[PDB]
Amino acid sequence: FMRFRRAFGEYSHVVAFNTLLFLMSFTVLCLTPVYSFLPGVYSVIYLYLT
Amino acid sequence: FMRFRRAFGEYSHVVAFNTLLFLMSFTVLCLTPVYSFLPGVYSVIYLYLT
């Protein structure tokens, strides 16, 4: 993490959060066609969390 | 963008807008031969925006 903060300057805070959100959404999308509940409730959870 | 901000010192802000306006004017000049409306209205909009 110390090595990571050396690059990307001030924008590392934005980059890390964007990557984390993309990775969180990717797992849900990959797990979508087994539990059909996820596309509905996950959108509400994301809206509340944002 | 971080790499660009590493160089050019304080004048990166001046360089960026100067390049963007030049690109916009180049696009407008390229669209001139078919759309004859552009030279007047675009100049007026540019004067308003400046």
From Swiss-Prot, chains A, B:
Subunit text: Interacts with PL-PRO and nsp6.
Gene from which this protein is expressed: rep
Function, in words: Plays a role in the formation and maintenance of double membrane vesicles (DMVs) replication organelles. DMVs are formed by nsp3 and nsp4, while nsp6 zippers ER membranes and connects to lipid droplets.
Transmembrane portions of the chain: 37-50
Protein name in the entry: Non-structural protein 4
Natural source organism: Severe acute respiratory syndrome coronavirus 2 (2019-nCoV)
Compartment(s) where it occurs, according to its Swiss-Prot or TrEMBL record: Host endoplasmic reticulum membrane
Mode of membrane association: Multi-pass membrane protein
Residue intervals on the Cytoplasmic side: 3-36
